[PDB]
């Protein structure tokens, strides 16, 4: 995510009241780094009819 | 362009662009002109030839007289046509009863007001329909008028065609009013609009300004102070533009809410923001930026350079705004804000008093005066006025005109001429309006809503008469309960009677209970403006002087009041219950009843415990208080409290004018007779209508005052009194309050009751669709369900509860606005706010009536210390109930030897009149000299209280 | 809370109309000779509709065929520029619209002498251009043109009008601003009669007005098929006077 | 949403990322789909851009509609895995496809018979740090090889050559043009736009006929 994303909390007015939209932290995937996938490898089946 | 219809009727296109949310939304409408536009006056004989009925089949009323105020020729007889600006400047000048009786409102002028201000637009909507014999306002729909309609000229702004059409509007008028020589006077304030008629451009027209009109009245001296309107040390900043704040709102830049400016610190205030937890202070006179306390404003955070420890881009401020919430979690250095725009002024008409420094005695001319307001938090207003030598020892009404840049104190104008300072009648008056109490008599459109007889009506004895069936189609459910024996415990000083009860005894083993509450609902209807005044006034108020009432005087006090032997419509509810107060059955219906006598507070007790007046009406009475105790028991055993606060009643001496006697209210045995069945009607009928309407039913909820409202007493209860409260259940609290009584002072029972009053939760009316079922709780009265029912006149809340009951018995379809939770929340706050506006004056009813007592009748008595502080102690006379801080130096001499303790809450010292080491604790007994002198900087009659 | 003025106490509406008044009402006949033999154009205020009718003719498939009477297809075209605010998605299977597509069929199952047009197809094409509220009865009045615009066999005129209710007061010929402001009813009225083709109520109505409310629209509806008639007739005179 | 498929829970979103004369080349293969009667495989790789796509034949299928004198062609362009060209962007090409083969196919040999053409824009690299216009001529080649594999009567090995946002399709060894496609480019560069297209066409058709006659 961002360090501190610009996309922050916003308010919406009711007919006298108000609430707050939560801050919108948009997750971003790296252009470069990656990790593999963890598998219960001892359950990887195969198929046959 | 334009096109024609075959009825000679014109059609064209008015088209614009909606600028909402910054969008560019093109909006086109067709437009019609008509040729049946009435001139609406007395003298003309041809506009009454064209008047045609509405859908309610009525030809309306042509009310502007042949006889205006006639003036000096070349005025003669004249009518007045206005500017929006002269209305926008002088809206209250219009409301003078003394003048301006005949004014045409142009439609465009009507619209700019509707463009500008919504509740100001109410007032012109108010005045035009509530025009009378004296004063007559019409609205001429001039741009619906074919013969006054104009277009947009080439190379024109919208402002030009506004002035031109108003000029065009006046142009038709005198043309139609040539035959009767009643002229038409166009009033403006605009100097360029006062330029084009200098040459008399097209019309030989009456273009005068306000003062240029005002200087031609026969009585203009009384009204020219109602004309609206260096003085510099620095320059105040300004408020942001429209696109700046609308550009500020979406980005999270700007914030709005409400502000509280302190009295103990005039130049500092905080707001409660929706994004923010803590109250965010605004420090600095320039940063308050010439707004007043209570207004809706728009604020901006300040940089950390201006933050307080107890850029160009908005890219910086938002990241700094995140740092504010960090600093909000600090509470060590907390942010400051300033205002940058004002969302709304909370201005209105205001009442104060003038400064003797501001007035010259020898002068008779116009001069600046400042008004000391009754509001302590709001500053003085420079008033350029003539008659100040008159009005200095007099009360006044002003209205704020404007704030230009230079003026440290605003420009406003005096409006209404009230009366003499500390005269009882004038001090009655502003006590109403500054507490927001409606007092004005019922207008001409009100009295067209009362039923048509007067005090010569009776209910029809034949409940099945065909004309009475033609009078009442719903008479099918109206039963006849005139064959009951009814008597009501009422005050002596009461003709607004709400109650009507019988009690029979059924031979099954039980009593027969029937209580009757006045069916005004047959007469107040949604769509009747009298019922709107039931909303507008909200309630009736109750003072030692008088009793201003929500309903007209004939209506509530006679023809709905449940007075003896008079044929009246009520709603009847029939109970049966055992000797164990267990209700058998309940029966909700309308009736017409017949009564025996309405009692006094005392006359009823002259029938309860007398054991001589022993007819079966009284045997119905002795049923009630017998089982009212079980209602008293099981309500308080359910977890309720029973306080005692004799809010004392000023027995004004019946041979004199100003009060100097202090008496008390006495609550005898008759009070607990009636009340336990009235709250029973507030619940059992409520337990019916919740079963009828779960989502729209009017209810009232009461919460728990927690330990936080009680621990600060508990420290005084423990460190000094070695006691406390329970706070587990409010039965156990009410039983830990029953044990906090001292034997040498049996009033120390009651002394806590009046004192814990100040921190009890404010119960409030609401619609049950707002919240859930244990949130319907009344904590102080231990019931999970709670409304009010039993007093229609002072509670419009109860009257609505008749209406949603009217469908619960099937009498009537429910009205729609009694089903819209949007309309309900607008009601439930406001009707509480009227009840808030009641007892703030109800205590103040006692105030000035105590405020005359200690004016010149001093005494040495017992006053009780309710606060021990370092500045001094606040003493309180239990015989009087008025407080006073005997500040430390006038509490004691040698204040360096005076030592205030916080834990013991003692201000131990050597006195002023003596030197013995006086350990000033709390809740002991003292000698104290009473007095009162009105503070000349506030004009509140302060209780001059001085120890002895 | 509306910041505007619905209906004046002085008896007036937004353009100044009375409660018993109409918009400008314009029809036209043979607007598209090169397109189909039914071609008629409506302006009722700013409600602007192109109305097109094809038939009586051969089907596209022998499946869609009867040996007794005609068929009737309704194709409604609501443009995305029909309103002020431009609608995002298309409408061509919107369940709101299909209702009306059902509706005009059963409204016009019973004017067409169906038996005397068997094995053939009637297709009615709709083009909603400018939308001004009163939208339902706007259509039907355009239909009644278009069937006569080819001169198809029928019984009668059929009139349509939405009439609204502000609290107590009927409003002949509301607009979309007034439509979102109050409760409205549209009436599909047949000829000179007191019998109904269409009756549709969405809004919530107190019962007791309704007989009176229904009693309103007939005088409007009779003035509708009034103004349709001569307007056709002055066209109808224009033919033979210059044909012959 | 769509009740016919598995599209996950709605509030999810796909993953996001940010910044932290040359040779064209082929590999052409037939006879590898047993559903069809004509298949063709195309690899392409050029300078930043690697592209693979599949052309599929079904014919002659019966027509339930009515009588025709002759045959009828139907062409589908479908996105493969990564690159997503626009929907209306697709069928315009499908329109441009059919016009050329209507100067190719002996439909008169095939009365009341249908032609089904499925083109799978299967995978494309564009690693370059009118994006559909760069893939036009390879389609025609990919179709022609599959249409030879179903063995349908074709007049010519017709092909298109590309010169910088411009597509021109030839016959008769370039001595006539059968299909013209132009985007922005220069003005009056047409004469050079004849040439570079033609020689790629002169390249490609030789690559095609090698793929079949040597098999």
mmCIF file of C-alpha atoms in Angstrom, chain A residues 13, chain B residues 116 239-242 245-246 249 254-259 273 288-289 291-292 294-299 339-347:
data_model
loop_
_atom_site.group_PDB
_atom_site.id
_atom_site.type_symbol
_atom_site.label_atom_id
_atom_site.label_comp_id
_atom_site.label_asym_id
_atom_site.label_seq_id
_atom_site.Cartn_x
_atom_site.Cartn_y
_atom_site.Cartn_z
ATOM 1 C CA UNK A 13 -24.365 14.556 4.855
ATOM 2 C CA UNK B 116 -31.862 34.364 -1.056
ATOM 3 C CA UNK B 239 -14.676 34.929 3.705
ATOM 4 C CA UNK B 240 -13.814 32.586 0.859
ATOM 5 C CA UNK B 241 -15.591 32.648 -2.472
ATOM 6 C CA UNK B 242 -18.275 30.266 -3.652
ATOM 7 C CA UNK B 245 -15.576 26.534 -0.550
ATOM 8 C CA UNK B 246 -17.414 24.190 -2.905
ATOM 9 C CA UNK B 249 -15.820 20.634 0.534
ATOM 10 C CA UNK B 254 -13.030 22.317 4.640
ATOM 11 C CA UNK B 255 -15.212 21.430 7.577
ATOM 12 C CA UNK B 256 -18.469 22.698 9.026
ATOM 13 C CA UNK B 257 -20.405 22.316 12.228
ATOM 14 C CA UNK B 258 -21.203 24.615 15.098
ATOM 15 C CA UNK B 259 -19.031 26.831 17.281
ATOM 16 C CA UNK B 273 -16.383 18.250 13.700
ATOM 17 C CA UNK B 288 -12.903 34.236 14.720
ATOM 18 C CA UNK B 289 -13.320 36.673 11.808
ATOM 19 C CA UNK B 291 -18.839 35.701 13.219
ATOM 20 C CA UNK B 292 -21.104 35.255 16.243
ATOM 21 C CA UNK B 294 -23.799 29.550 17.597
ATOM 22 C CA UNK B 295 -23.499 30.192 13.862
ATOM 23 C CA UNK B 296 -22.835 27.618 11.146
ATOM 24 C CA UNK B 297 -19.374 28.368 9.791
ATOM 25 C CA UNK B 298 -16.730 26.775 7.597
ATOM 26 C CA UNK B 299 -13.314 26.277 9.164
ATOM 27 C CA UNK B 339 -12.860 29.996 10.161
ATOM 28 C CA UNK B 340 -12.634 30.727 6.454
ATOM 29 C CA UNK B 341 -16.314 30.937 5.573
ATOM 30 C CA UNK B 342 -19.661 31.150 7.343
ATOM 31 C CA UNK B 343 -22.104 28.394 6.411
ATOM 32 C CA UNK B 344 -24.987 30.304 8.003
ATOM 33 C CA UNK B 345 -25.596 33.196 10.351
ATOM 34 C CA UNK B 346 -27.768 32.291 13.308
ATOM 35 C CA UNK B 347 -28.929 35.909 13.465
#
